[model samples]
Target: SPRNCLRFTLLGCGSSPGVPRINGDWGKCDPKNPKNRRRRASLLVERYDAEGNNTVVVIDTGPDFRMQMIDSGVHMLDAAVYTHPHADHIHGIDDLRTYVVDNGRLMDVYANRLTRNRLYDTFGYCFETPVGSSYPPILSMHDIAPETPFSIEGAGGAIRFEPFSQVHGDIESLGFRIGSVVYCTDVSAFPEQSLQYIKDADVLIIGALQYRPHPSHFSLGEALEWIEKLSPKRAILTHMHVPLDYETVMRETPHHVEPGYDGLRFEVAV
Candidate 1:
């Protein structure tokens, strides 16, 4: 009722650990260099109404949930929507328990039953253990099967949660779409059903790691081809594993397409 637009902000864009592996990645990335530093994966979306009422939603928590939220300056979160159960994509779930301590109640999480299964296995307390009446409440999990549409307070109307198959080295991951934005990383191929859900998105967030081909992730060229097929107004590549500089990659992307980085934000009309 009177809502008109939705916007998104990038909270994290790193692949796995997000940057060069550990100790001395010095040459892989200069320690003194800011671009070289990376965080886990995550995204923040804010919805606004004609009345200027605002709402906030997050996609995937990754390992950097705490710092990403802190850096984003967001005080309220309506829900956490997950993409997969990989440790890098889902580990920050524990932090959500703490968010409830500050946000006034248990947080809700959305994912398919399969993902929910993995989540149950990964973060057992969130589903089975409950709060135990000992610690503050953390999360209230909501299971969303593929092709299901659900509503979140601040995410621009009743957004649909449709799944996309993601190939991550046999890890079994997924990507999802909300409104006109489709976010899928760690995938190179899509099952036939996958395209049906993603066809006409206006903005797409994809995972393209490196310039070379990887068994699980999309290479730069492949990501671009997918972008063309999906034909979104804009596309941003994510989950990159070092083959180019962020700034240059942004420049290299065709016209409206881009390579996303942390702290990036965009507005969309609902």
Candidate 2:
């Protein structure tokens, strides 16, 4: 069966704080094991729409986004979707200026109203004019309606995405569905109604923050349980903390599930 391919890349799989904490300590993760090394959590999706054009969508631009995107071979960016307004997920927003300069247009960023408000409050200069600043402002904000599907056109093609809500401790996070792939990070729980969007997905990429239970992120056990319930064809765990060892996680996780690593790519047909 000929399939329309959607290329997915895990640009980063480490927890917000990441494995190698500032002091260069890799924590429980083995410094010798490259897989144990990771950047902040983020992802990229690329594909050609039915029109035979290229489409690129990036989810979350963490502090490491510049290198992540460059290493992933993403030269042009069509649109960006933010999961939440956490520092780890949006600190690299300023880097989008390069794309704006290259494309000579404002870049579009999609987020729920909560995230949208925080983004503007925190990065006001990026969204509004900066007094006495000569640099070009690059990003434009767009609100995402829950359970509503939206489309973005790229140089090569167009792609559609459905955004859903997920619980993250006191706050909430956004999850996206593009083709058969569902990406949800910074998630602790899902609203009952939200499960329908991710049910039986071809590939489920989610976050597992630690070994023991955590307040805002899923533990390894909790993550595995979600994977089982969702019953996706395959599952890849991301947003790992130091407690999780790459080889160890692989050994314990179900065969259909594995630890997501930086630059890991998955392709699915629509």
Candidate 3:
């Protein structure tokens, strides 16, 4: 039962299209509240060895992935775990090219079939070569099936991950349990089996779009309901859309359910 502690950073927590749209629409979010100014949803997990070398793994490379990595000082990445193929989740995948260059090797990306297929179709160049210099392959894809435990040999040490499938309205998103920490997003509902892996988690980063109902994502109320049901020692609400104020959510939710924001950090035992 012994383990090592890993540091986690909530890189982004905004919903699709992100907050403060191009039209300067902040919706119901407070323009002044820093927490309301979110990037797309993503997380960075890092483990440090005795010599202080670190291995970094990222979850979901949203459009803000580049900025997120720079802001967090994560110069290298061991791998990326894709939750779904939604535009908000995978658009920044190309930014991974930089990491590929840094590591001097192809970046390892893991996703379910649905997501992997979409990635291949949408960002073909990252996976395969086209006719010209416009495309450069930088990644090596791997399949992450439900309940399949996998391990990655990273810079500092080795880390393990378990993947589960969650229903995202018409499609499915993968929920991952990296040690005692769970990173789930773009989820509308949980398959019965998925709940088994989430129970007793120490840190749960689940999506909570807004207070109203959503077809493809969890509403704030729905997210809270699951947080109570899953009973993670702590739950951080993320993937926020409009009409949800960070301060208001903090005031309304239980002590364990805190509103997520860019750059929020915590630690967990792996």
Candidate 4:
């Protein structure tokens, strides 16, 4: 039997504004459907070794990071990998302070140069210790270049990640491949070189913003085209907007593809 090596969780599947945005606008999504309710996009990856020891890593700490952690019942985290520095992706960064405070250790954070600069600009306090303060920095930043591979070590073992650059309109985001899973979000297009990293993944979790084409995101149709080309064993759509209804997308997509929802969990073989 194949061992389940990675447990992937969609902590949130909603777009930047999230579902039922501040004023309670659900848009085309059915308010009655619980799956339609979403938080900002984020993913939690738990890797387990044969001995059963596990390591946890989260991708993109969106505004709802606090609640997402609480809701998912994740008590421990090993490290964090950032896709970009968009407000929706990094706003909840402060919440990570709890881990540092409790563990008495700095959290390891990985990001590209642009995202790192943005993080330093936005959350200087987290990285730099203030004068006369006995407290240490909350996070330890690590550099990750596009098309580079890195690994995070934990009690169980090491989990490797292959990162590729993705186009996000005026900005750029990172798409990560871990084990047999590929997680790509906030992407408008994939650089030709990046395609080699994500081919034939067992699980592909990509973002699909809405029904219509968007300059900075992959519309449902475009996402489907990639799904067809990649031919992953399973594909889950995330970073959804209000216009997409959970059940409607479920019925419309191929049998192997499905719309992700908050708290959705699945296992992938290494």
Candidate 5:
């Protein structure tokens, strides 16, 4: 079985305003190290086949979506998959319009029904919701049903996806398996279904906001435990709260598990 895809891109990897927060955050971050700085969380999957056709799948258009793409040098997008609908993850959605302009209309987005509802509420012009006379056209929403796989026609091949419910402890969120990559963010705990989907990811990108325990996010130890359970080939940590340095936390992690930085590119083939 030959591998299927060639290249992928990482767009963002920060919890919120990214490294060097707007409030002047250049302490252990070291004002001299650019890698120490980060953007919001998101990624791009670029698939290339022998035929010369390519597909670009953007995952999670977080608040830094624009800069994420710019930083990663991604110009086009076939589809966008959302991990969850927190403001940090979805606010930069308007940035998708750049692709819309490139593709000529609304780019399809994949998300759970609840996430779509939240998206619709925030950007109604894309839907039939009546505008407030001042609201602008934001984005269109597609309600994803768990376990049912769909296509992301914007890219190469019919991209397939399956979702599993993730518990944020406060609200429910969705994580998914796209090809051999399982991306789960804003996750605290996983049910059996989550484990099922995550059990064999070639590269599982997940949330590890801190080293110590937290109420809503997963600690490094907990994340490592989950990775052990799933037995993925590799795991990369994303999303943080100004608590861990990119290098420091990585030093504590196993070699296969490390901190993901903005603009880094790699691939996963199933």
Candidate 6:
């Protein structure tokens, strides 16, 4: 029997400020290299059952969400899962309303308690119905906790997800393991319990901010060390800043590890 499969896409792989800051500062990155250009961090996962039908889910609707969706050519979004509530992660949330309009139903979003609260606080109108108003809620929020498994139904089938907690400076972020692939970003460290979920992953996509230490995100060295410990068949570094050049990092890392770029796509058996 054929196994379930997941097609993972790196929507954007840059840090919050992104490569080539708004002021046109490319920093250490070479302007001649197109791969050095990046947007906010985000991922798109297309789940397919053995039968070939598929469902689409997006992780982290960053500030570049609108463009990311357009660039990916994904017209349908079955669900959206959030990792944290930072501006770069959640600011593009307003773009989700289009899905709601297209689907003729509220868009379903899943997030941990902290992220859920932050979403409600910041985008109240999206969830709550205003008094004496005919407007319907644009999004429906669902609570997801660390270490708990959840599923989202789609046209093809239900896609299972395992959520794990990660240390992001003073805050916490959510990492997910779906099938043999793990997607973790905006993390400084991983909890002991979370390691169990990441164990034996075939592909691991993680955050690697820069060469130096950062208060919240992992430095390239730190990310490399963890990748070594985890021993995934393949590792892709994401959420990079200007200091890390695309080709330079690609040439420096181990053969199995490489710097992720926008629109990078691959499939893994679930």
Q: What are the lDDT figures for the candidates, one per model?
A: 0.74, 0.87, 0.88, 0.91, 0.76, 0.91
Write down the TM-score of every candidate: 0.86, 0.95, 0.95, 0.96, 0.90, 0.96
Model 4 pairs whose backbones collide? none
Better of 1 and 4 by lDDT: 4
User: Model 6 over residues 136-252: C-alpha lDDT tens digits?
Assistant: 779988889998899998975878899999999999999999888999999999999999987778999999999999999999999999999999999999999999999899998
Deviating ranges (above 4 Å) for candidate 5: 1-6, 26-28, 129-138
Q: In lDDT terms, how accurate is model 3?
A: 0.88
- Give the per-residue lDDT digits (tens) of candidate 4, residues 172-253: 9999999889999999999999998888988899999999999999999999999999999899999999999999999989
Model 2 ranges with Cα > 4 A deviation: 1-4, 49-53
Off by over 4 Å in 3: 1-4
Candidate 1 steric clashes: 1
User: Which is the better candidate, 4 or 5, if ranked by TM-score?
Assistant: 4
What TM-score would candidate 2 get against the native? Answer: 0.95
Candidate 4 worst ten-residue window by lDDT: 1-10
**For model 3, how does the per-residue alpha-carbon lDDT over 133-234 read when each residue is reduced to its tens digit?**
676699999989999988888767977889998988898888898888998888998999888889889989999988889898899889989988989999
Clash pairs, candidate 5, are: 55-155, 55-156
| CA RMSD of each candidate after superposition | 3.1, 2.1, 2.4, 1.9, 2.9, 2.1
How displaced is residue 100 in candidate 6, in Å? 0.9
